[model samples]
Target: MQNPQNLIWIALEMTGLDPDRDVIIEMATIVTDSDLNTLAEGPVIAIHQPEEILAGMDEWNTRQHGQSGLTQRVRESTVSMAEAEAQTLAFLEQWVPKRSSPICGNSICQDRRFLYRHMPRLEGYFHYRNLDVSTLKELAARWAPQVRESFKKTHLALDDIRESIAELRHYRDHFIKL
Candidate 1:
């Protein structure tokens, strides 16, 4: 596997993003892998300055209040998010290699080698979810210090995930003011 830093740089470049201006990179070492639930999506990258993308949509939605015109904009935003996710996944598949040895199907994979090997891919996914490059980097940096925190205690908890989903749905509902 390539060096994590190098791989991250390559991935950033592949996205046609200017790392210097578009993102802030943060690197951390996971001290221990105990209770690390692989299924839990906590403490990952977060995009900052999401207003850069959402502000325009917000204005459009406000302007379309009580009109059916906002429907199309909502659909377009959803599609854009989905397309971005798909693109990020495809990029990971091409850039990262599959795990060589199969590990137990239990929760946390804890395979340091494998995790480190695919760190860049993981970072890519984090960035995709974060939506804004700088915010993603900022979130990653903020979460790095608490890497060992239990997933259940963090935003990755099942309840938290549900709440987040509901919140997003609420946002979307208002997103199409009409």
Candidate 2:
């Protein structure tokens, strides 16, 4: 594959793992070049969902999102998942070529799955391939024990994406040796 000049980094906070069963509560994105230099920061949208959906999160999600204050934000936000999707698409269109950059971040395939269900149109803005930091971390764990990558997971979408970007940069410096 030809190297991409830009990457679309996405981080989502959701109710659960099942895209069909759960729903997105918050979304954040960043546009960056392959060197991980920031291009533009996109909107951080808090999505409003029905009460049942908000109330139905598993214990882990409840504690995590609750501690992050995302739960309260979701309840108060006026933006619907559809509305957030449109905002994301518009942001991508303004910043990058359609279907050009791969969506990137840690375990971003999972984020893409959620997008596939709720934000299909916005999800279509990226190439099918993704740049996942978690994959590199896994390889680092087994192959290079000295390479350490850890971050305070704020759980907020934008902050979380920032951490993932830094984590990937650590790996890149080690392996690519630029």
**What C-alpha lDDT values do all the predictions have?**
0.27, 0.84
Lowest lDDT block of 10, candidate 2? 148-157
User: Candidate 1: how many backbone clashes?
Assistant: 5
The number of the candidate with the highest lDDT is 2
Residue lDDT tens for model 2, 3-113? 346889999988998888888888989988777988888999999987787788899998988888888898899999899999988887766887788889989888999
Query: Each model's TM-score?
Result: 0.21, 0.92
lDDT of 1: 0.27
lDDT (Cα, 0-100) at 29 in candidate 2 = 93
Total clashing pairs for each candidate: 5, 0
Q: Give the Å shift of residue 24 in candidate 2.
A: 0.8
For residues 1-178, what per-residue lDDT tens digits would candidate 1 score against the true structure?
A: 2111112111110111222223221111111111221221222222122333333334443344214322333334323323433443454344333331112111122222233333444433322211122232244347543422212222222343333233323333433244
- Candidate 2: what lDDT? 0.84
Off by over 4 Å in 1: 1-118, 125-129, 132-156
Winning model by TM-score: 2
